[PDB]
Assembly symmetry: C2
Homo-oligomer: 87 residues x 2
């Protein structure tokens, strides 16, 4: 079935360190945050502590809604670069 491979960094003071993950057509925001937290060894806590944002440009980050399908809520015309932001 359908997929996309995205880049996820932590929310950090200037840009920086992306870890790649596989997003299926079925993946909602908490599963993709759990995958992104595993790529960064976040036994420094829970998927509820975290929101996900897409980097549209320097002046725009796109907020992924709490239980949304990531594959269809993302802007797939923009670059696949995301923040794992600790809310």
């Amino acid at each position: 079935g359908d997929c996309c491979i995205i880049r996820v960094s932590l929310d950090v003071d200037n840009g920086n360190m992306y870890k790649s993950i596989l997003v299926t057509s079925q993946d909602k925001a908490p599963t993709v945050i759990r995958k992104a937290m595993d790529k960064h060894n976040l036994d420094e806590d829970e998927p509820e502590d975290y929101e996900l944002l897409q980097i549209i440009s320097e002046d725009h980050k796109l907020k992924i809604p709490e239980n949304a399908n990531v594959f269809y809520a993302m802007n797939s015309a923009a670059n696949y670069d995301f923040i794992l932001k600790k809310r």
Copy 2:
């Protein structure tokens, strides 16, 4: 970037054995066919001896052109079921 998880079987000894491959936007037929033949253990022949072959419906099959990007040459509106065939 974008991708699909595709499963491939053989045209040969009549019981349907699937193997999954991850196909990216950049993947060409002979390279995904290479992966499929290694996954089925096809070791007498070269990747040029073989075509792919998406099952569009019963009575209907799609030939992926020999040097084409599988991701954009396949029927994305259909079953992600492929068989590997001689010629």
